[PDB]
Amino acid sequence: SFSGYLKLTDNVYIKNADIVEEAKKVKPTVVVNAANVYLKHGGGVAGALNKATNNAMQVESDDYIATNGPLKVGGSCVLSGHNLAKHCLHVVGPNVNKGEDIQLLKSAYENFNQHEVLLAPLLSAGIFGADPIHSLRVCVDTVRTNVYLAVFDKNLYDKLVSSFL
């Protein structure tokens, strides 16, 4: 199961880890992708997860969009986890660098409540432009199911733990 995580709350855990390496080791039921509405997995966590699947995540995602159209900011869809997990929950947090409303971050984290346990990144963090400290606060105050947060950057991980209320 998940190992080496620091316990933040009754249901939220955190670790300084590369989510691709973590997913390959644990093979969780659900890995969360930091998706955009088009499921174009070019960079950030999405680019990394898609590269680990040898682009199979992108081929599946393009068929999903061709059939269903784009997701909503704050929405999600469940697709295959390929070689990383049973399922991938593609969640769209607001991208501050595209001028999207940070208030949609709580709606994005509500998608996690449909799954009993998840391996996830902090939504809207990294190249999505939000404050990761804020994202962790919204995560703890919204998600009720068991969430294992992987934070790639060691310096950010230390800042998140040391400033956690």
**Residues making contact with ligand A1AI6 (CB under 6 A):** 18-21, 24, 44-45, 48, 51-52, 126, 152
68 vs 97 by CB, closer to ligand A1AI6: 97
Closest contact distance (angstroms) between CB of 125 and ligand A1AI6 is 9
Q: Which is nearer to ligand A1AI6, 47 or 144 (CB)?
A: 47
Q: How far is the CB of 127 from ligand A1AI6 (least distance, A)?
A: 8
Task: Give me the residue whose beta carbon is nearest to ligand A1AI6.
Answer: 48
Convert the chain into a string of H (helix), E (strand) and C (coil).
Answer: CCCCCEECCCCEEEEECCHHHHHHHHCCCEEEEECCCCCCCCCHHHHHHHHHCCCHHHHHHHHHHHHHCCCCCCCEEEEECCCCCCEEEEECCCCHHHCCCHHHHHHHHHHHHHCCEEEECCCCCHHHCCCHHHHHHHHHHHCCCEEEEEECCHHHHHHHHHHCC
Q: How far is the CB of 52 from ligand A1AI6 (least distance, A)?
A: 4
